């Protein structure tokens, strides 16, 4: 019954090709709703969900101003990191940031987040108590001491427990039809002989929201993972998700394998059997 808001940003330096590129996106649960791209012509935060289009022009100007300031801050932080790691200015590097909050089905604050990675690896993160940091190496520890002395953690709590929560709640109401709906998985199963000894069974879940789901194979009632394969959950492009799980079985034995499907929109877990 809880929900989440997340913002994700990526800065990529381009030595000799100009200033670093900055791309930010915003999600409520698994539904995107804004974006900003420093190389786009508009230079604006742009809508990506229908329920956000109903925000007025002061919203888009303010949000544009905030994301642009972030792009400059991480411009700078890319330079400083190069210094801390004693790296040459000729190489390209990435700085990723994530921040947001969870609310309970209650409507009330559950969790806040604020985290960085450099070249794909943890740098510094705000711990759950919102009073302390976890740094990944000696370089991030310089930043860690700097941020403790300046009480950055305390100064982030207004946003994480106020603005963040307030906006997420408003979004959940302006978009109840989209964001508070559950789409149960439509399931089927497929069967392909691959020898006269063996066949593959593939268990499908289609058209479901939110993305969280579990597919498991049992043989004769016991969980089986040997000879199975499970793909990453993936977007259909219409706002729903897809996933499948497959198992190679001895020809003739298909009927002792069952696939089990758990999802929030399933009152009861589904069982599929060929």
């Amino acid at each position: 019954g809880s929900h989440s808001m997340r913002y994700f940003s990526t800065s990529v330096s381009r030595p000799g090709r100009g200033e670093p590129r900055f791309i930010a996106v915003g999600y409520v649960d698994d539904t995107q709703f804004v974006r900003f791209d420093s190389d786009a012509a508009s230079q604006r935060m742009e809508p990506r969900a229908p329920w956000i289009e109903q925000e007025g022009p002061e919203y888009w100007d303010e949000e544009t101003g905030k994301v642009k300031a972030h792009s400059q801050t991480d411009r700078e932080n890319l330079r400083i990191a190069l210094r801390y790691y004693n790296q040459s200015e000729a190489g390209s590097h990435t700085l990723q940031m994530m921040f947001g909050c969870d609310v309970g089905s209650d409507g009330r604050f559950l969790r806040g987040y604020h985290q960085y990675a450099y070249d794909g690896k943890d740098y510094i993160a705000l711990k759950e108590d919102l009073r302390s940091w976890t740094a990944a190496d000696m370089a991030a520890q310089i930043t860690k001491r700097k941020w403790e002395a300046a009480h950055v953690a305390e100064q982030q709590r207004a946003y994480l427990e106020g603005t963040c929560v307030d906006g997420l709640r408003r979004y959940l109401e302006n978009g109840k039809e989209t964001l508070q709906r559950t789409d149960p998985p439509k399931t089927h199963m497929t069967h392909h002989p691959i020898s006269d000894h063996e066949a593959t069974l593939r268990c499908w879940a289609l058209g479901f929201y939110p993305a969280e789901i579990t597919l498991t194979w049992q043989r004769d009632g016991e969980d089986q993972t040997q000879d199975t394969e499970l793909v990453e959950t993936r977007p259909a492009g219409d706002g729903t998700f897809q996933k499948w799980a497959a198992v190679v079985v001895p020809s003739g034995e298909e009927q002792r394998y069952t696939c089990h499907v758990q999802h929030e929109g399933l009152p009861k877990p589904l069982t599929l059997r060929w």
Partner: peptide, 9 residues
């Protein structure tokens, strides 16, 4: 809503 973020490493 985004956060106003200006801190330096």
């Amino acid at each position: 809503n985004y956060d106003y973020w200006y801190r330096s490493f």
